[PDB]
Structure 1
Amino acid sequence: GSLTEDGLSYKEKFVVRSYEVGSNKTATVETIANLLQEVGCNHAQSVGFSTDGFATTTTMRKLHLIWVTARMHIEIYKYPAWGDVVEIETWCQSEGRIGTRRDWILKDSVTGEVTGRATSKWVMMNQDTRRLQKVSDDVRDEYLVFCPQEPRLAFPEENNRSLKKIPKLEDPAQYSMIGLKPRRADLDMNQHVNNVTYIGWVLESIPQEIVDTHELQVITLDYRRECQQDDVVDSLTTTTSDSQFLHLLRLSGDGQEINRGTTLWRKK
């Protein structure tokens, strides 16, 4: 991978691996999400930011401040097949004192056509107290020189799927997958659960008949709380309708919410 000619975005090519594909011989949404996360790491390394998923500066490290994902939105038109090369382009943009946004464009290396796109909202948080805070001007100026100055949105449409309010699922849920625990392969280098695992856990409550006859087109996921290594999760789904679903991840014991989201599927 490498920064583009203007140094305001990053591109990387990936060959789809054998263990990265689902039952339709194409990459899973979790493989796509892992690749967006990997290209985001390489963009942060290529410009001197901390490489560990938190994209910190020496100022943030001193203050014990990290960037955390608050929302992930992904739309896939064509899943790359096993052996195919996918080219992902990523860039960041400041959203004032609210936080940062990271966008992605997925393309077929052979045809050059857009096969998918993603957007994510990141917030500043103290790693110890887990207390969110507004972005300070000392921090803003450190990353602004690596962002395009004019708006560059992967999802430009005025009021679109990526910025909608997600409601809380009402009990009883139509579908559920209970007793979900993370293993060591689900943890990152800092022993925290990888944000791609939450996507897999959300999709675990989608019935197999939907997976066998439909393809996932859109997924929006809000991150409210983190799941610890020794926590147990319950995944809940209800049909709100193409097939649309409302999702909810909550701790198995007290029922504390960790995630909420929506998925949209198309008939194959």
Structure 2
Amino acid sequence: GSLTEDGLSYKEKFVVRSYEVGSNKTATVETIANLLQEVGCNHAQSVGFSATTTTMRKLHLIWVTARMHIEIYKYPAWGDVVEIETWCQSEGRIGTRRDWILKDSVTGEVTGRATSKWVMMNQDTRRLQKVSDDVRDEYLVFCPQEPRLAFPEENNRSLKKIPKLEDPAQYSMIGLKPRRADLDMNQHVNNVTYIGWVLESIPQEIVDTHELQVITLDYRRECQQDDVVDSLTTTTSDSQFLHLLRLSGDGQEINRGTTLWRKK
């Protein structure tokens, strides 16, 4: 992959692998989510971030996901080349935004798009801080100056408020525990695991007859390596669902989201 001519976005092509595909012989949403992370990470390295700034490191500050929104029109088939373009944008003192565009490498058609909101947190106290002037200056030089949104439409699904699922849930998957392959290089549970965990409570008949079109996820708390999770789902309707990930014991909310599925 490489940064574009202007140095304000990054592009990378991926060939879909045999183990990356589902029952339909196309990449899973978890494979797509892993690819968004890989292209975002390679963009971070290409601009010297490797995604902390020097001032964030001298202050024990880290970027954490608050919201992730993915919309897939066409899942690439096993063997196809998917091209992904990604870029970051400052949102004042609120935080950063990272956007992605997925294209079919042969036709050039847009096959998917994602948006993510990131916030500043102290790595130690976990207290969230508003972005200071110094951090914005270190970041803005690698961002487009004019707004560039993967989801520009007036009143779009990427900015919708998500409600809390009320008990009893229609469907559930209980006792989910993260294994070592669910941890990143810093021993934290990876964001992709939560997507898989949310989808575990969707009935197999829905999965077999429908394709996932949209997924919006709100991150409230991190799941530890020793925590046990319950995944809950209720139909709110195309088929639409409301989801909730909470700790098995105390019931502390860790995630909430919505999914939209189209008939095949």
Question: Normalized against structure 1, the TM-score is what?
Answer: 0.98
Deviation per residue, 1:158-203 (Å, 9 max, x gap): 1100000000000000000000000000000000000000000000
The residue matched to 1:124 in structure 2 has which SS?
strand
* Distance in 2 between residues matched to 1:252 and 1:112, nearest whole Å: 45
* Distance in 1 between residues matched to 2:177 and 2:54, nearest whole Å: 34
The residue matched to 1:63 in structure 2 has which SS?
coil
* Distance in 2 between residues matched to 1:262 and 1:148, nearest whole Å: 30
Deviation per residue, 1:84-133 (Å, 9 max, x gap): 00000000101100000000000000000000000000000001100001
* Distance in 1 between residues matched to 2:234 and 2:6, nearest whole Å: 45
* Distance in 1 between residues matched to 2:154 and 2:122, nearest whole Å: 33
Deviation per residue, 1:215-243 (Å, 9 max, x gap): 00000000000000000000000000000
Alpha-carbon distance, 1:4 to partner: 0.2
Alpha-carbon distance, 1:257 to partner: 0.2
* Distance in 2 between residues matched to 1:226 and 1:178, nearest whole Å: 18
Alpha-carbon distance, 1:75 to partner: 0.3
* Distance in 2 between residues matched to 1:19 and 1:49, nearest whole Å: 31
Query: 1:162 matched to which residue of 2?
Result: 158
Alpha-carbon distance, 1:3 to partner: 0.1
Deviation per residue, 1:29-79 (Å, 9 max, x gap): 0000000000000000000003xxxx0011111110000000000000000
RMSD between superposed Cα atoms in Å? 0.4
Query: 1:132 matched to which residue of 2?
Result: 128
* Distance in 2 between residues matched to 1:131 and 1:209, nearest whole Å: 42
* Distance in 1 between residues matched to 2:169 and 2:8, nearest whole Å: 44
Tell me the percent identity: 100
Consecutive aligned runs of 4 or more in structure 1 exceeding 4 Å deviation: none
* Distance in 2 between residues matched to 1:3 and 1:143, nearest whole Å: 16
* Distance in 1 between residues matched to 2:47 and 2:62, nearest whole Å: 17
* Distance in 1 between residues matched to 2:22 and 2:219, nearest whole Å: 25
Query: 1:87 matched to which residue of 2?
Result: 83
* Distance in 1 between residues matched to 2:240 and 2:93, nearest whole Å: 33
Query: 1:3 matched to which residue of 2?
Result: 3
* Distance in 2 between residues matched to 1:91 and 1:109, nearest whole Å: 19
Deviates more, 1:70-79 or 1:56-65: 56-65
Query: 1:12 matched to which residue of 2?
Result: 12
* Distance in 2 between residues matched to 1:153 and 1:57, nearest whole Å: 23
Question: Normalized against structure 2, the TM-score is what?
Answer: 1.00
Count of residue correspondences: 264
